[PDB]
Amino acid sequence: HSHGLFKKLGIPGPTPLPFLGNILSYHKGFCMFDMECHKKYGKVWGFYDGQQPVLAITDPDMIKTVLVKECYSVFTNRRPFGPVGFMKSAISIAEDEEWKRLRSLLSPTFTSGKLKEMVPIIAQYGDVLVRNLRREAETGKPVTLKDVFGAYSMDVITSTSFGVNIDSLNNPQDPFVENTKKLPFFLSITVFPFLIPILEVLNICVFPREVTNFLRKSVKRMKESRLVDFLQLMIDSQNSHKALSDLELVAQSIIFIFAGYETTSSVLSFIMYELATHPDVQQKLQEEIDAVLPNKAPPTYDTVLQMEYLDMVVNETLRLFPIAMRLERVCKKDVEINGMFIPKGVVVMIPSYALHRDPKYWTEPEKFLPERFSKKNKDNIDPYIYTPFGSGPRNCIGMRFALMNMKLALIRVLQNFSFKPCKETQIPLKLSLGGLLQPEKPVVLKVESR
Ligand code: HEM
Ligand SMILES: CC(C)(C)OC(=O)N[C@H](CS[C@H](Cc1ccccc1)C(=O)NCCc1cccnc1)Cc1ccccc1
Ligand SMILES: NC(=O)CC[C@H](N)C(=O)O
């Protein structure tokens, strides 16, 4: 029973139950459990997901040591989850030097400059987003934002990943919309992670085996046709590391879809919940959007980077709702960091959500206050506490793309509409008690036309 480990190391934490460990304690969610451990235990604690020891760490130096200083040597991979099948080749899932290769091959895809070329295609769908919003706006009926934002998120994806171009909300069941639609179990992994190789030998998959088979073929539909977008950029690359294979490109595409789809849509919904429940911040943003882009002029790459308040609204939103919730690295070797022994196989965990709401680093942390990210105040913000995109060599590769995409949505939408709360709006919003950082009730708000 692996449940003596922290107890030996002199590291504190909750007593595990046989077999389940501390998972019973997840009934309020990952987040509330992390906060309560933090406030009960201080700078470090340990717990067991089943038999898996997990060590939480909250010292910023120690966090930097783990995420950055000792990344390639010790804290290189994430907690293995499965069964993944061919998606083991996905970059977010791959390990050790197999990953170091993929990161290299896929990096220039995400540069400052390549993102600059991607904006005019993201624009044409900002319009779509607005005319989609208008036909819901002139019909005075509260709007579920995950739906209209989700549709925009997806529109960006298929063009930026494959050059495909659809009006998904309206324009129909396109041969591409319904596969990507397959966009309770994942807990019972952890009492039984010895069953992963069982499923992995039953060829089952957490990526529905028909979606992938479609993209696997739909991507190999797009390849031999050409012979602007991620596919392009990846394909152009395979012309020091071995070039990207053919099933590898598919799995990365899948990861880009998974990554971008329910992230862009959900943050955008959080931002509009906050903007609507704070009518004044919406006002200041709408002023900035008009002083920079007068006469509803179309946003650009450089004018997006110019909007400082827009950036403050985005950053603070992700402080309250960091959708990763936690960052995790597998300790791959017996190791000591900043005066603490961490033994092999331990999963080291950084409770991002809990650290973003710590009253010790943040005043009024449950309040939404975009002035903490002002040039005046922004300096006092430890980048190893605020880590909505991770840090170090393994942080979110799509960071600059995520931000640009979202801001482009916001600017366009805020140029035509203000957003009020509605009687069905959940005030105060509540996080889905499950494993995902989404709201319980979906965000429904009033939309008006300026
Ligand atoms: C609001 C949007 C997003 C947020 C807040 C976000 C945040 C994060 C975080 C916290 C991580 C883990 C970082 C770490 O472990 O240190 C991550 C990983 C990752 N993200 Fe994002 N992400 C977003 C969107 C995207 C998008 C649009 C892409 C598009 C390609 C993307 C691609 C990835 C990949 C590939 C990884 C894993 C990278 C690796 O393991 O090398 N993400 N993201
Ligand atoms: C089951 C659990 C929670 C233990 O394991 C994870 O589900 N976890 C990620 C592995 S599957 C995920 C894609 C996916 C596949 C099937 C169903 C849902 C999701 C993935 O790899 N997404 C990386 C792309 C991304 C997502 C979010 C933000 N940015 C980029 C690994 C991971 C965890 C946190 C942040 C980044 C990666
Ligand atoms: N380049 C590296 O990351 C590792 C260096 C070492 N020579 C090796 O081949 O593993």
Side-chain angles (χ1 to χ4, degrees):
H1 227 25
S2 75
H3 287 162
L5 169 50
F6 302 117
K7 150 202 186 316
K8 180 220 60 168
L9 280 180
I11 287 149
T15 307
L17 290 174
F19 291 132
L20 316 176
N22 300 98
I23 60 184
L24 284 206
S25 306
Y26 282 168
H27 80 297
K28 299 281 173 177
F30 299 75
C31 295
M32 317 297 172
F33 170 61
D34 282 357
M35 306 269 299
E36 287 162 7
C37 279
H38 190 21
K39 183 180 68 65
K40 260 195 269 138
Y41 296 116
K43 81 157 200 305
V44 286
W45 63 94
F47 57 104
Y48 306 78
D49 290 320
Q51 313 269 19
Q52 170 65 62
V54 179
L55 181 80
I57 56 141
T58 73
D59 185 44
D61 270 324
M62 193 171 300
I63 296 177
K64 182 190 180 166
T65 305
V66 158
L67 289 170
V68 188
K69 293 170 188 155
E70 300 295 310
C71 165
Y72 290 114
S73 44
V74 184
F75 300 111
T76 308
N77 323 287
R78 296 188 177 104
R79 155 146 42 168
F81 85 109
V84 288
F86 82 97
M87 289 292 308
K88 60 160 184 293
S89 297
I91 177 179
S92 42
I93 292 159
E95 281 176 11
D96 304 332
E97 303 257 346
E98 276 65 33
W99 160 82
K100 189 143 50 157
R101 173 176 162 281
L102 291 174
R103 185 80 177 192
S104 241
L105 293 170
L106 275 174
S107 288
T109 317
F110 294 85
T111 58
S112 38
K114 305 286 174 40
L115 178 56
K116 182 132 87 150
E117 285 185 311
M118 284 202 192
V119 171
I121 315 96
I122 302 182
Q124 173 230 350
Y125 302 125
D127 318 342
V128 164
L129 172 52
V130 170
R131 284 190 317 277
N132 269 350
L133 257 207
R134 166 131 306 99
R135 190 203 54 261
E136 319 279 31
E138 278 166 319
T139 77
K141 178 179 160 66
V143 173
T144 66
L145 300 191
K146 33 169 303 161
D147 284 339
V148 43
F149 278 139
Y152 160 86
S153 163
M154 179 96 87
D155 285 339
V156 171
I157 274 174
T158 70
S159 43
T160 65
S161 53
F162 318 122
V164 176
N165 309 278
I166 326 179
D167 189 8
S168 59
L169 186 78
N170 295 127
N171 266 117
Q173 321 85 317
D174 190 274
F176 214 98
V177 172
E178 291 186 342
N179 273 278
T180 56
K181 276 210 299 184
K182 345 205 180 196
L183 62 107
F185 160 92
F186 305 91
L187 292 162
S188 176
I189 272 299
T190 300
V191 179
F192 304 150
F194 64 97
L195 292 188
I196 302 174
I198 299 213
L199 315 173
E200 294 273 35
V201 81
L202 316 197
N203 297 15
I204 338 176
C205 219
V206 288
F207 300 79
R209 189 47 68 174
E210 53 183 350
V211 188
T212 85
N213 287 337
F214 168 87
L215 299 175
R216 277 175 59 163
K217 66 194 177 54
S218 301
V219 171
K220 83 177 292 181
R221 272 195 202 108
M222 304 164 172
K223 293 193 52 173
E224 289 183 302
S225 29
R226 323 181 165 181
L227 160 92
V228 65
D229 46 40
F230 288 125
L231 157 62
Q232 189 68 41
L233 300 195
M234 300 183 57
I235 274 197
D236 302 346
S237 295
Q238 52 182 133
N239 308 116
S240 73
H241 296 273
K242 278 164 68 191
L244 272 172
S245 157
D246 296 319
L247 189 85
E248 295 188 315
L249 188 147
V250 174
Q252 320 314 321
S253 293
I254 291 161
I255 275 300
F256 293 161
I257 298 167
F258 269 105
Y261 172 66
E262 210 160 327
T263 50
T264 284
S265 124
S266 290
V267 183
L268 280 174
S269 294
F270 280 119
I271 298 176
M272 299 317 300
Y273 170 78
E274 297 301 336
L275 292 188
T277 70
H278 296 94
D280 36 272
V281 183
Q282 206 181 129
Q283 178 140 15
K284 205 182 174 178
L285 182 47
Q286 289 184 337
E287 289 163 359
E288 168 170 288
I289 295 179
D290 301 331
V292 171
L293 306 165
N295 300 115
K296 268 181 213 175
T300 77
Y301 176 92
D302 292 302
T303 50
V304 161
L305 302 184
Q306 180 176 330
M307 302 186 177
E308 296 179 35
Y309 200 76
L310 171 59
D311 188 58
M312 295 158 55
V313 159
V314 170
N315 291 352
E316 160 89 325
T317 292
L318 292 159
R319 185 189 55 87
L320 284 176
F321 309 107
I323 51 187
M325 269 150 128
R326 310 150 140 197
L327 312 156
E328 287 187 6
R329 307 286 189 264
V330 168
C331 167
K332 77 161 69 152
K333 264 307 195 207
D334 276 8
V335 127
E336 182 152 349
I337 55 172
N338 306 277
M340 171 185 320
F341 177 68
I342 299 182
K344 183 180 191 140
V346 171
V347 171
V348 180
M349 186 277 278
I350 297 101
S352 296
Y353 174 105
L355 295 178
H356 291 182
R357 289 158 174 273
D358 192 355
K360 286 211 173 219
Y361 267 98
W362 307 92
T363 77
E364 307 187 272
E366 305 226 312
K367 297 204 125 181
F368 167 93
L369 293 184
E371 281 290 296
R372 349 160 164 274
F373 291 93
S374 70
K375 199 141 74 171
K376 162 168 172 179
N377 304 326
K378 60 139 88 165
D379 313 330
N380 289 337
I381 292 195
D382 200 303
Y384 298 107
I385 305 318
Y386 188 62
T387 56
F389 299 92
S391 202
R394 195 108 196 210
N395 80 333
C396 166
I397 210 193
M399 176 173 71
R400 297 164 153 258
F401 176 77
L403 302 161
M404 176 61 63
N405 184 17
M406 290 181 289
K407 297 191 183 154
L408 285 175
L410 294 172
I411 294 163
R412 228 41 172 143
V413 159
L414 278 166
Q415 276 175 326
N416 321 107
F417 312 111
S418 270
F419 294 71
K420 286 227 171 315
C422 277
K423 116 186 178 199
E424 39 281 61
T425 315
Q426 178 186 81
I427 291 135
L429 177 148
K430 310 206 198 304
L431 295 159
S432 123
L433 275 44
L436 321 168
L437 210 65
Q438 64 180 20
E440 284 192 339
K441 252 71 178 61
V443 180
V444 305
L445 297 162
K446 178 146 72 164
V447 178
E448 294 174 346
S449 184
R450 307 168 61 190

